[PDB]
Amino acid sequence: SIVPATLPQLTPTLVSLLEVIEPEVLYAGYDSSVPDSTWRIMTTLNMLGGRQVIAAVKWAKAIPGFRNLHLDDQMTLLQYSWMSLMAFALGWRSYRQSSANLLCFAPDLIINEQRMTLPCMYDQCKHMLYVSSELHRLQVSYEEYLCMKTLLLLSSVPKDGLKSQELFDEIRMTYIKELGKAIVKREGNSSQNWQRFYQLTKLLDSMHEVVENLLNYCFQTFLDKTMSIEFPEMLAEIITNQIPKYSNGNIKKLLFHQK
């Protein structure tokens, strides 16, 4: 046995340095989706709508308070709102990429005129073009656009309400106030704030007229095998759950402005 010692004489004190070490680099961008066809978007729109509604779920959950909504209602809202979110998403890209003449299904896919006017396309796409045309006529900013996309998310609910509706209502009203702010700080003057606000709001309200017709296409092609239209599992579940309620008037269209 030997006298002990403070060995090795190599015991570090990195404590002040460990307090210093904190930073790391974080990155943006989490997922991606495109269609793989043009006139055949008559079936690929559903594959895209599937991926876009799923993205819309991730996006919706990312908005504070959405995940605290009952799941049954979170899914009900995407089940009914996916159609306006899709048409509106096309709207923004169309507005900026083709001066709202063509629909832009993904940043990498624009369907041109030679396919755009075919009935398999146009019977549904003309309503999506209405939306693109209005964002362009209205000269919507990206902030104003996002406020509206966010508003559309909670715009279509059952006539009987939502299980956790009180939180949905607080979230939806926060969103409309945000649209107002996006406009007030951009147009200037007073008369232009209310005109830009109400004109953009009229698009949110008219999105329901767009949805009535776009959904009727999907409902009809979902049930009538004569149409030969394929759906992804996501929309197939949404559409079987949505048809008996939407076409029968059991779904309420929420408007943010009066006519």
């Binding site: 307090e19 210093v20 904190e22 700080k185």
Partner: protein
């Protein structure tokens, strides 16, 4: 007199240098400075400095951002000027002295102020002008770019 209220043509590099060192507690000299003022429907004066080194990871430094001092009517308002300059440019150190912005300052008033919004876009444009001038100088631009 406050350096930023002095005439930009008379102020020397040594004067801006010492000011900067005191402003940022940076033992080293500044890389470049933009000094300008505006008047008319908006009036303010400002100094925007580019450091010779990128900000360091120490939390004692990071917790103090956004380090552009704000003065209103030459009254010191604050050291942390959120919403004054976009975050991507939050490496520029400086002083902004506004005349139109109200003295009734709270973070919320400032966030909702159209005056602050205009000042911010003007400061950005000036930052970009400074960067362009640096871009013309190949040797010093490279030093800047690396950081």
């Amino acid at each position: 007199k406050p350096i930023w209220t002095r005439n930009p043509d008379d102020i020397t590099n040594e004067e801006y240098g010492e000011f900067y060192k005191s402003l940022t507690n940076d033992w080293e000299d500044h890389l470049a400075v933009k000094h300008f003022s505006v008047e008319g429907q908006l009036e303010f004066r400002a100094l925007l400095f580019v450091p010779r080194r990128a900000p360091f990871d120490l939390f004692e430094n990071r917790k103090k951002k956004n380090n552009i001092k704000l003065y209103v009517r030459r009254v010191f308002i604050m050291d942390n000027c959120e919403e004054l300059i976009p975050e991507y440019l939050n490496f520029i150190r400086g002083v902004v002295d506004s005349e139109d912005l109200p003295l009734n300052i709270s973070r919320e008033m400032l966030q909702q102020s159209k005056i602050l919004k205009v000042i911010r876009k003007n400061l950005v444009k000036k930052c970009l002008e400074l960067f362009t001038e640096l871009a013309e100088d190949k040797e010093n631009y490279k030093k800047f770019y690396e950081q």
